[PDB]
Amino acid sequence: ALAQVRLLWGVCGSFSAVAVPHVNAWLRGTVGVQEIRTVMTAQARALMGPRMIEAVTGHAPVTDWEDHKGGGAAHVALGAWADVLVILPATANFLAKAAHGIADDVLTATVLAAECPTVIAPVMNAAMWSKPAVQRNVDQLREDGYRIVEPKEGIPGSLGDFQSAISTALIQAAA
Amino acid sequence: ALAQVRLLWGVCGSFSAVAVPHVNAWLRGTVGVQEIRTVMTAQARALMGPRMIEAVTGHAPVTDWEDHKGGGAAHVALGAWADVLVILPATANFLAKAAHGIADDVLTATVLAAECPTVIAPVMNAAMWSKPAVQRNVDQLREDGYRIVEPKEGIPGSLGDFQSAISTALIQAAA
Amino acid sequence: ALAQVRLLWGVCGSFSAVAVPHVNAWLRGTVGVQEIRTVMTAQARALMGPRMIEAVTGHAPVTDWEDHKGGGAAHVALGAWADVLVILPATANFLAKAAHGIADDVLTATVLAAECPTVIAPVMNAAMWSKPAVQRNVDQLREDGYRIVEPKEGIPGSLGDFQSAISTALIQAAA
Amino acid sequence: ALAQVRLLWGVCGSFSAVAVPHVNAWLRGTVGVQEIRTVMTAQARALMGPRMIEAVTGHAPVTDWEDHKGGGAAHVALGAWADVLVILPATANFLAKAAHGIADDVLTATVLAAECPTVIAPVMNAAMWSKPAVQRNVDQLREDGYRIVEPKEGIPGSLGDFQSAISTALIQAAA
Amino acid sequence: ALAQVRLLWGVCGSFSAVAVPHVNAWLRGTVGVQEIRTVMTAQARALMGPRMIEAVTGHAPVTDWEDHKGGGAAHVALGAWADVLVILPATANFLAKAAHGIADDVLTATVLAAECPTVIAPVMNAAMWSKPAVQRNVDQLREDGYRIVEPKEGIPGSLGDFQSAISTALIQAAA
Amino acid sequence: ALAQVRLLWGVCGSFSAVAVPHVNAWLRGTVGVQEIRTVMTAQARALMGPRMIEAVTGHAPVTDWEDHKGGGAAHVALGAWADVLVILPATANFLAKAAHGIADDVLTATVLAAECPTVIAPVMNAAMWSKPAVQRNVDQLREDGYRIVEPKEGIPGSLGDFQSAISTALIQAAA
Amino acid sequence: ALAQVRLLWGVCGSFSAVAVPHVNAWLRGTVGVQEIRTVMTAQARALMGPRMIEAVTGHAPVTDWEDHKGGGAAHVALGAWADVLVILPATANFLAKAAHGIADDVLTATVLAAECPTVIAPVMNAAMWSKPAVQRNVDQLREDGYRIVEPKEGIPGSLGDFQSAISTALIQAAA
Amino acid sequence: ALAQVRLLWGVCGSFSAVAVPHVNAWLRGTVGVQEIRTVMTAQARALMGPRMIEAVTGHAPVTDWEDHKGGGAAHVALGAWADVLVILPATANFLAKAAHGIADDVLTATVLAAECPTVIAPVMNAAMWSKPAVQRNVDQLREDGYRIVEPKEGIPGSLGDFQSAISTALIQAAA
Amino acid sequence: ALAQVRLLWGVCGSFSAVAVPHVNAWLRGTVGVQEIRTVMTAQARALMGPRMIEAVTGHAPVTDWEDHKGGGAAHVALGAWADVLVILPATANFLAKAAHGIADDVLTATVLAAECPTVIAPVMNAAMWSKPAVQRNVDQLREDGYRIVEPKEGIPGSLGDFQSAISTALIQAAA
Numbered sequence A, B, C, D, E, F, G, H, I: 001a002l003a004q005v006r007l008l009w010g011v012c013g014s015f016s017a018v019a020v021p022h023v024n025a026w027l028r029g030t031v032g033v034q035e036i037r038t039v040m041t042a043q044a045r046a047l048m049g050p051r052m053i054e055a056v057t058g059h060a061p062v063t064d065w066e067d068h069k070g071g072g073a074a075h076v077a078l079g080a081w082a083d084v085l086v087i088l089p090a091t092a093n094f095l096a097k098a099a100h101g102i103a104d105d106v107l108t109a110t111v112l113a114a115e116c117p118t119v120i121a122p123v124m125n126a127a128m129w130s131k132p133a134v135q136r137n138v139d140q141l142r143e144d145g146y147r148i149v150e151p152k153e154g155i156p157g158s159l160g161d162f163q164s165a166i167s168t169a170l171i172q173a174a175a
């Protein structure tokens, strides 16, 4: 039943954005998700280049407001469309904006507009992860109902074990 | 005495920015305000275009620091000039920045520098308004002394009943 | 049957272009028109900004020839699509071009290509409206079959009583 | 009493635009006009360069709408300000636009907004002056109340005897 | 004697502009014209591209005033040079400008300066050709001495029978 | 039955690119082909301009990878879409790239990805056509299964008799 | 041992950024620091100009991510390099971002990556310093272990007594 | 001794360029190579973005000639430095250029300048791999001494079994 | 008779382009050639700068197609004008393009259009000269009738003994 679940996938400016192809193959070839739309922060776009993400996912990523066509607006259209929202990788920056309701780009505004199970997979090095401000944001996001997948230590952070959390959200959404 | 009250009017990137000419007619033709200066966020400017706002309000809206002339700085000059400060429409983004003392553009820096009665009229859809982070920001601004005019649901949010709140601030300033 | 009438709406560089969202809500929420496509002159676009018009009307306004996609050309495609053509607001400039068959932008070329009931609602101040050249253009357009909605003088012109003229055209087209 | 007459001076893209400094000295040093504001067409600006006109006349010529600051608009502000309007040199192009109420730049829109004695001094070669279309425009402008100063043939047209026509208009305005 | 006739050829932004090479081959290889200079409107240049026209006709087409080198000006130089003037294809826009003596680009200014037999071959669809304003312009041009070659209906207009009209003008010029 | 054949049409930077509208009129108005998509080399686009080709073929020509939308990449998507591939006119440059499996722009990459009847119609002058390297490429392309329409000598080459070759390919595809 | 302490120096967009050369002279000529690297916010760079700071500090200030060379990333590299981190002057804006773990430019990302004694010297006028949001941010940073040097009000704030706090930080780092 | 082998790594504009981070981790963390420098084609750079490649490999990739500093030139310096040269992924385009000695960018010029064991790993879809010209290029490169790792068919080609070929080349170079 | 031989001289992006002034003086002051026109590749222009070649040879080099004026095209005009064609210095890249009939810039297209004795003087280092692909291109060009002047090893290649080969070509052309 996962084939009709609409997965919205946000990508932030982290080293781990290089994992996007591998994660996309897992989502499509192992989990069986069919409808995936991506939103890139401006920093993610500058590091990875948005054109290859488009070719490998089948949709141009949304980065600028101008990418939404017609009535309404990118964050409302994407927020209403999403059955599951995954932010992977998330930056420490994203955690702060999401925890405090900041909405100064397409991704963080879409967070305010989405009403669906949401998984956030932050990545950063150990010094950043240990800062009290970062941990306050992690705690705040959990109290607001977001599923946080803590990073691992791949020596330089790396993605945590997100597969189970994402599958849980997809199954909850399918139900 | 309402003709000498100096009204600073901030405009954020909301659907409801199209209401600015209408609100301006109400401010001038019904309330009797004469001296009105506007500050637009970059997003408001990108959606609405500043040249028509200039034509109907009599002053070019300030968006970049470059729009302030001479000594000081835009936020200090506008902040000291204001007898009443109105943010209409305010974005969810604005609420987050004002609640936490962020000052990363002219408008939010002017908020820190202004010392006058302030009315904030946020606009956003129902999904965004219901987010815990947004409501924390609303509550925090009320605790800090800001007057919040809650949005309506105009089917896609719409401006609340701001006329009474703004009139009260203009009259309190006249005294 | 008014929901199937295809309304083409031209917008010129007048002060009254700020009224476009209000007129759009009236057309949709009261008259019941569903398919509305807009053409903005370069001057209208420079004053009002097309991105907010796009967001509230559901279609990007056409200004440059490049905005039409595929075969043909913007004026032929838009002219053939239209069941009713409304120019609101119209400039004095527009009256001169339409009256003499000038076609030096998309809007005035579409006028030549459209074969449907057309309502023109010019706006300008009293000095401009009284010019002999302007009145010759008004007279000539009426002789050519165009419905002219004369402006009011709301102190600086304002839109006349167009609702009856537009309703008539939508109803005549529905038949 | 001619020193308080406000002279609005339009300049078109003619060979005879080189006479603007000489005419400016005559207007100020011989006729005694004190308040002179210039409007240049885009073509006039491209041939003559706008910065020197500013340095020798004391005011930046208006060419783009952006040159008007504050409320309203260039054509209304200049049109209401003018006590006498002089177009010198005028192009054949200008005659056509003025004769038909075309208002597609600041100059020709200001013509529609001005309500004062107006002198037009066209310049062009003999082949152009003799065209039936040009003479229809000359006749139409005279019937509309404009004073036309016909060119001479200085071998390639040259300015006619405009001094008497301008002086008459300034005197009519003073009364 | 047709080899010494100087043919000035204006090209407007019509679907039929693709015929310029074919007409050029006919003029050179069948009629025997040797000296052919082209003027393109800005819209014609935007559609057809002047570099290919230059390569097949032997002269760079003139579009901007800057394309004329040395003393004088493009419209005077080209107008005095022409023994025959052909506008092919002509737009509805051109008919309006030529009929009313508008001279707001090189081509329409050259029309005012040329004193030679002139052939105009307009192209437009049936709806545009049927407009009263267009037919007024056609009638006015015929009264002023211009030869109009009415279009065909090639299904989207197509060029009329210009071969006879142009040959006649070229032979008339040779005499 | 030829109306559903998907024709992919490459255009190279040759003098004979001016023939594209004529060939298109024959393909659409006589043969009945309905879906025609073009790929222009950078040189073809710079000489001919893509805007008119778009207007008469119904699709914007593709030159840059970004001109193609969505997943798969331009050469794979266009190569798979094509039922017939026609290169007309082809440059000597193209023959060389096609003969050697060079794929350094969209067109030559699309050649590698296309699996359909293909007609190549080179045009060049006699000196270029006689070069040994050029004739090696022609021979090599014939051995690889491509249908070559050799140019004629039309004073400077001209297109050969391509209609029969193209008709044959369109019929093979429908079969 | 103070000559080997690696001092990372962040500069925000405050009036007091003009004091950077004087503070640099004290750090080098009186305290004895040798290796000083600066990070400027975009607003600081726009105010002070990074070329003179480079000339007097010996290193180009880092503002954009592109300034870091090789592996890793500016914030990790600068954050790991720093033995002491000084923000002087800090804006109210900086206080908000640092207090909430926002990392939306190089400077604030480096704060999260740094693991060293940090001194923050905010500057702002009296109205801004008295805002509740600003004072919450000051308190939060103190609880997080940051040393805050409160501003003075030299009539428009001015730097507080940072010499004691910075010398303390530099000396502890040498130990 | 594999840690001192200098590996030069060329990257072409293929879908499989997203595997560059994964392949880099294997080269560093499993094979133990320490000095790896990359050269990207313009198309590879446009797809993947060189900034993330720089951050994860420790060296900015070379794409433009300007990236070489000092005497000589990029292709000579990189070609002499290389102990093993790996092109992964290689495009069909690369195969053609390398097979025919074309050197029209940094990568293909470096191939001519390198004198070391070279492994080429082409990727392309099944239609492209089966083209006769492509297979001629594969055969020619093998005859010239290049190691070709044929692609796989991962349904859109995928990298072949390069691990064995690269390990062999690195080990032979260490010996 | 060598003073009337028209020498066309192509310059590629090699280190040895610094020899162009020396070769030009030898050609003019010692051999006596009077009519010399140069063609530079984009790479030659980017390395050497085109302005000084113009100053020292008396002609601006042709690099872009836009440099040819009037009918035809740069490669046809230059190819027909040439009595002798010299490529000095030639790159390895040039050898490949000439050997395979590639014509993707003005120079390599002029090679296809030229019908005259041609001397090619390649320069490259020893590693590049020894590549099988390069020697295949040398061999193919000799079989096609081109005179190849092999480089020397100036320790980094240097021009071979071209004087005899060029003199032979110029003298044969005079006959």
Ligand SMILES: Cc1cc2nc3c(=O)[nH]c(=O)nc-3n(C[C@H](O)[C@H](O)[C@H](O)COP(=O)(O)O)c2cc1C
Residues within 6 Å of the ligand: A011, A012, A013, A014, A015, A016, A041, A042, A043, A044, A047, A090, A091, A092, A093, A094, A123, A124, A125, A128, A157, G065, G072, G073, G074, G075, G103, G104, G105, G109, H051, H052, H055
């Ligand atoms: C190459 C590179 C890798 C980065 N990786 C991370 C990361 O893994 N986690 C993180 O919090 N920030 C990382 N950053 C810093 C962020 O990109 C920076 O905070 C940025 O402002 C975040 O923008 P965004 O959250 O809007 O995408 C990295 C920066 C660079 C240049």
Ligand SMILES: Cc1cc2nc3c(=O)[nH]c(=O)nc-3n(C[C@H](O)[C@H](O)[C@H](O)COP(=O)(O)O)c2cc1C
Residues within 6 Å of the ligand: A065, A072, A073, A074, A075, A103, A104, A105, A109, B011, B012, B013, B014, B015, B016, B041, B042, B043, B044, B047, B090, B091, B092, B093, B094, B123, B124, B125, B128, B157, C052, C055
């Ligand atoms: C057409 C359009 C309409 C929008 N309307 C709203 C809105 O009504 N309320 C809101 O919170 N955000 C709205 N947004 C999203 C904001 O523009 C976005 O959060 C932006 O970052 C806010 O910028 P600002 O607060 O600096 O003006 C809209 C966006 C677009 C493109």
Ligand SMILES: Cc1cc2nc3c(=O)[nH]c(=O)nc-3n(C[C@H](O)[C@H](O)[C@H](O)COP(=O)(O)O)c2cc1C
Residues within 6 Å of the ligand: B052, B055, C011, C012, C013, C014, C015, C016, C041, C042, C043, C044, C047, C090, C091, C092, C093, C094, C123, C124, C125, C128, C157, D065, D072, D073, D074, D075, D103, D104, D105, D109
């Ligand atoms: C702020 C502003 C408001 C204007 N309002 C009007 C108007 O109401 N009526 C009018 O005829 N011209 C008005 N103009 C002048 C026109 O914009 C000008 O004539 C322009 O050339 C018309 O362009 P268009 O008809 O192609 O839109 C206004 C100009 C400005 C700058």
Ligand SMILES: Cc1cc2nc3c(=O)[nH]c(=O)nc-3n(C[C@H](O)[C@H](O)[C@H](O)COP(=O)(O)O)c2cc1C
Residues within 6 Å of the ligand: D011, D012, D013, D014, D015, D016, D041, D042, D043, D044, D047, D090, D091, D092, D093, D094, D123, D124, D125, D128, E065, E072, E073, E074, E075, E103, E104, E105, E109
């Ligand atoms: C150097 C030069 C001199 C010109 N002189 C005249 C002139 O004297 N009279 C005229 O009608 N046009 C003249 N023209 C042509 C006009 O500039 C042209 O018609 C233009 O479109 C008029 O623009 P404007 O009326 O908006 O200023 C001249 C053009 C050039 C390049």
Ligand SMILES: Cc1cc2nc3c(=O)[nH]c(=O)nc-3n(C[C@H](O)[C@H](O)[C@H](O)COP(=O)(O)O)c2cc1C
Residues within 6 Å of the ligand: C065, C072, C073, C074, C075, C103, C104, C105, C109, E011, E012, E013, E014, E015, E016, E041, E042, E043, E044, E047, E090, E091, E092, E093, E094, E123, E124, E125, E128, E157, F051, F052, F055
């Ligand atoms: C592809 C295309 C074809 C057009 N064909 C015609 C035409 O055949 N006749 C016409 O009157 N207008 C046609 N138009 C509209 C004109 O180009 C438009 O009126 C333009 O402003 C005329 O410019 P010009 O008269 O200065 O060339 C066409 C537009 C496009 C985009």
Ligand SMILES: Cc1cc2nc3c(=O)[nH]c(=O)nc-3n(C[C@H](O)[C@H](O)[C@H](O)COP(=O)(O)O)c2cc1C
Residues within 6 Å of the ligand: E052, E055, F011, F012, F013, F014, F015, F016, F041, F042, F043, F044, F047, F090, F091, F092, F093, F094, F123, F124, F125, F128, I065, I072, I073, I074, I075, I103, I104, I105, I106, I109
């Ligand atoms: C006006 C013009 C016409 C040309 N005609 C031809 C031609 O007919 N045949 C040819 O092989 N090259 C011709 N060329 C040269 C090509 O444009 C040149 O070789 C170019 O590099 C080919 O680019 P493309 O194959 O990617 O389209 C012409 C060049 C110009 C400027």
Ligand SMILES: Cc1cc2nc3c(=O)[nH]c(=O)nc-3n(C[C@H](O)[C@H](O)[C@H](O)COP(=O)(O)O)c2cc1C
Residues within 6 Å of the ligand: B065, B072, B073, B074, B075, B103, B104, B105, B106, B109, G011, G012, G013, G014, G015, G016, G041, G042, G043, G044, G047, G090, G091, G092, G093, G094, G123, G124, G125, G128, G157
């Ligand atoms: C000339 C000038 C001086 C300023 N001085 C201060 C200041 O002293 N303190 C402050 O909090 N903001 C000051 N501001 C406002 C900040 O520049 C503004 O908040 C900005 O967005 C901060 O950017 P940053 O924190 O990234 O450096 C000043 C602005 C200007 C134009």
Ligand SMILES: Cc1cc2nc3c(=O)[nH]c(=O)nc-3n(C[C@H](O)[C@H](O)[C@H](O)COP(=O)(O)O)c2cc1C
Residues within 6 Å of the ligand: A052, A055, F065, F072, F073, F074, F075, F103, F104, F105, F106, F109, H011, H012, H013, H014, H015, H016, H041, H042, H043, H044, H047, H090, H091, H092, H093, H094, H123, H124, H125, H128, H157
């Ligand atoms: C998204 C995308 C993926 C591509 N993947 C391949 C590929 O895997 N193999 C291939 O031969 N060409 C592929 N191409 C086409 C090449 O990019 C094209 O041939 C290009 O000119 C090669 O450039 P290069 O060899 O200089 O890197 C792809 C193109 C795009 C836009």
Ligand SMILES: Cc1cc2nc3c(=O)[nH]c(=O)nc-3n(C[C@H](O)[C@H](O)[C@H](O)COP(=O)(O)O)c2cc1C
Residues within 6 Å of the ligand: H065, H072, H073, H074, H075, H103, H104, H105, H109, I011, I012, I013, I014, I015, I016, I041, I042, I043, I044, I047, I090, I091, I092, I093, I094, I123, I124, I125, I128, I157
């Ligand atoms: C400074 C410099 C010197 C070069 N010298 C040579 C050379 O002597 N021989 C060669 O084959 N390539 C040389 N190259 C590489 C060529 O410039 C490269 O192959 C280029 O793509 C050739 O372009 P062209 O043949 O169109 O001129 C050099 C490159 C640079 C940056």
